[PDB]
Amino acid sequence: DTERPVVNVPSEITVYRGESFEYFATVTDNSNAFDLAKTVVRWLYSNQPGRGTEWLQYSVTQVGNQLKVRIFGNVPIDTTIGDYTRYVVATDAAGNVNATQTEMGNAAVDKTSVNGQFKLIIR
Ligand SMILES: CC(=O)N[C@@H]1[C@@H](O[C@@H]2O[C@H](CO)[C@H](O)[C@H](O[C@]3(C(=O)O)C[C@H](O)[C@@H](NC(C)=O)[C@H]([C@H](O)[C@H](O)CO)O3)[C@H]2O)[C@@H](O)[C@@H](CO)O[C@@H]1O
Ligand SMILES: [Mg+2]
Numbered sequence: 001d002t003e004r005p006v007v008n009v010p011s012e013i014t015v016y017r018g019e020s021f022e023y024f025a026t027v028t029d030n031s032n033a034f035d036l037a038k039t040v041v042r043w044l045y046s047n048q049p050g051r052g053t054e055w056l057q058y059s060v061t062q063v064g065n066q067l068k069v070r071i072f073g074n075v076p077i078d079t080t081i082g083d084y085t086r087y088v089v090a091t092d093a094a095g096n097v098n099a100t101q102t103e104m105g106n107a108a109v110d111k112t113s114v115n116g117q118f119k120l121i122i123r
Contacts, residue, residue: 001029001030001031001033001092001093001094001096002094002096003029003030003031003092003096004029004092004096004097004098004115005027005028005029005034005090005091005092005096005097005098006027006028006029006098006115007025007026007027007069007088007089007090007098007115007116008025008026008027008028009025009026009069009071009088009116009117009118010023010025010118011118011119012118012119012121013071013118013119013120013121014121014122014123015073015075015120015121015122015123016075016122016123017075017076017077017078017079017081017122017123018075018076018077019074019075020072020073020074020075021071021072021073021074021075022070022071022072023070023071023072024068024069024070024071025068025069025071025088025116025118026066026067026068026069027039027066027067027069027088027090027098028065028066029090029092029093029096030092031092031093031094032065033092033093033094034062034067034090034091034092034093035091035092035093035095036060036061036062036067038089038091038095038097039060039067039069039088039089039090039091040058040060040088040089041056041058041069041071041086041087041088041089042086042087042089043084043085043086043087044085044087044101044104044105044108049086050084050086052079052080052084053079053084053086053120055073055074055075055076056071056073056086056120057071057072057073058070058071058072059072067090069088069090071088075122079122080122081122081123082121082122083119083120083121083122084119084120084121084122085108085117085118085119085120086117086118086119086120087099087104087114087116087117087118088116088117088118089116090116098114098115098116099114099115099116099117104117
């Protein structure tokens with residue numbers, strides 16, 4: 001397996017101050033096999049949910065040949081509204097990833113996107 005996994009995540013997901021939310025991403029791979037421990041939802045700079053979105057939670061569950069990545073949490077009532085770019089990163093059993101931190105950063109400079117990138121919109 002040299003072929004990377006593919007995340008399907010909505011390009012925008014909208015959450016609301018004071019409310020709980022739940023959205024999903026799904027993941028396929030040519031090998032149908034994954035490293036779930038290395039499948040995460042994170043911001044650019046580190047494998048963390050990110051400043052201003054520390055309450056962004058996720059879980060990863062395999063069902064058949066797909067991963068189901070639940071993206072969920074409770075938005076604090078006093079969170080800053082606006083847009084937050086975040087990433088679903090998946091890893092196949094062979095260690096291929098859909099996007100690396102370096103690919104994410106280069107896309108950010110160039111005003112573009114990588115597979116698994118999404119916009120978290122807080123209202
Ligand atoms: C601080 C800085 O300019 N660092 C750049 C770095 O820039 C970040 O790149 C991100 C890529 O995921 C985003 O483009 C960040 O911008 C936004 C975002 O997440 O979309 C803009 C939003 O308007 C802003 N939201 C609010 C409510 O202010 C968010 C938010 O501050 C952050 O997500 C943190 O929660 O930020 C952008 O800041 C990137 O361009 C790299 C490339 O190497 O270079 C510097 O590190
Ligand atoms: Mg693969």
